[PDB]
RNA sequence: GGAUGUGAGGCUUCGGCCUCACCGCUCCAUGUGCGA
């Protein structure tokens, strides 16, 4: 009924009514082939498997909170069929990627050179305000090998409104929220969390404006210091 | 003998500088020698 999460069971027959996946153009190959990637609130995984069976990763995490969105991907398999090879490659897992903790989260060790982080930045933001999306920002870099890359797809803020009733606490992290969307660049590339470079890479095309949200790229610099 | 480009961010004493990411790590000029 609420979905406060944004884990919405029919999510992409509205996001890719009948369609490809807008981002596919946008999202390129090399970033992911022979590569150890991690795809953060990965749905019922539909861009998870696609990207898995077509561009080659060596391994490829598909995370989710909901569990009933990650017995679905795993059923999902099976529509993309004809180690390193598909579906080998794929896993799912049910968690919360937002550590309640920051030493859980500076405890993080490295080990993806991709993290994804499509459409999951306001979920997080409504649910766990600003220190839990500061928490899965720096997690997310402690995660990323040195040379990995954080691909973000942000939602703005101006479409955080329209769900700010969903339940108390998202309404009240709603009105303490101070880092917004448009801070979020300056912020991944602060000491704070210590990303080096980053770039928009382009905004894809979508049957909805709502879905035509800008794609950057986050580097995490390649030498130690 | 000639040729070092691009982008994001930050700094600047407006000369530039710093980090990272790209793009390359090569191309061009050149015989009054040689004739298996
Ligand atoms: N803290 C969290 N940890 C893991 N997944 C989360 C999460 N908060 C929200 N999610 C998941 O994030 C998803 C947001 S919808 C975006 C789906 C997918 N990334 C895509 O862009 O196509 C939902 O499936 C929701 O369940």
């Not at 060596?58 to 390193?84: F, K, P």
């Not at 305000?129 to 797809?153: A, C, N, Q, S, T």
């Given at each position: 009924?609420?979905?406060?999460?944004?884990?919405?069971?029919?999510?992409?027959?509205?996001r890719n009514?009948?369609?490809?996946?807008?981002?596919?153009?946008?999202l390129?190959?090399?970033?992911?082939?022979?590569?150890?990637?991690?795809?953060?609130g990965?749905?019922?995984?539909?861009?998870?498997?696609?990207?898995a069976?077509?561009?080659?990763?060596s391994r490829m995490?598909?995370?989710?909170?909901?569990?009933?969105?990650?017995?679905?991907?795993?059923?999902?398999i099976?529509?993309?069929?004809?180690?390193?090879?598909?579906?080998?490659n794929?896993?799912?897992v049910?968690?919360?990627?937002?550590?309640d903790?920051?030493?859980?989260?500076?405890?993080?060790?490295?080990?993806?050179?991709?993290?994804?982080?499509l459409?999951?930045?306001?979920?997080?933001h409504?649910?766990?305000?600003?220190?839990?999306?500061?928490?899965?920002?720096?997690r997310?870099?402690?995660?990323?090998?040195?040379?990995?890359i954080?691909?973000?797809?942000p939602?703005?803020?101006?479409?955080?409104?329209?769900?700010?009733?969903?339940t108390?606490?998202?309404?009240?992290?709603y009105?303490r929220?101070?880092?917004?969307?448009?801070?979020?660049?300056?912020?991944?590339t602060?000491?704070?969390?210590?990303?080096?470079?980053?770039?928009?890479?382009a905004?894809?095309?979508?049957?909805?404006?709502?879905?035509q949200?800008?794609?950057?790229?986050?580097?995490?610099?390649?030498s130690?210091?």
């Amino acid at each position: 009924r609420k979905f406060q999460y944004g884990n919405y069971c029919k999510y992409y027959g509205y996001r890719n009514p009948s369609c490809e996946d807008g981002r596919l153009r946008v999202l390129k190959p090399e970033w992911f082939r022979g590569r150890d990637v991690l795809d953060l609130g990965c749905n019922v995984g539909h861009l998870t498997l696609s990207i898995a069976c077509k561009w080659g990763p060596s391994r490829m995490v598909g995370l989710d909170i909901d569990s009933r969105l990650i017995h679905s991907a795993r059923q999902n398999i099976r529509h993309y069929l004809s180690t390193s090879v598909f579906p080998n490659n794929v896993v799912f897992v049910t968690g919360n990627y937002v550590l309640d903790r920051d030493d859980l989260v500076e405890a993080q060790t490295p080990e993806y050179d991709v993290v994804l982080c499509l459409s999951l930045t306001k979920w997080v933001h409504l649910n766990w305000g600003d220190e839990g999306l500061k928490r899965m920002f720096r997690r997310i870099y402690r995660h990323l090998r040195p040379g990995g890359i954080l691909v973000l797809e942000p939602q703005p803020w101006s479409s955080y409104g329209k769900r700010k009733t969903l339940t108390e606490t998202i309404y009240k992290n709603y009105y303490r929220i101070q880092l917004k969307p448009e801070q979020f660049s300056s912020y991944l590339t602060s000491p704070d969390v210590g990303f080096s470079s980053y770039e928009l890479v382009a905004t894809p095309h979508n049957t909805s404006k709502g879905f035509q949200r800008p794609v950057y790229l986050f580097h995490k610099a390649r030498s130690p210091s």
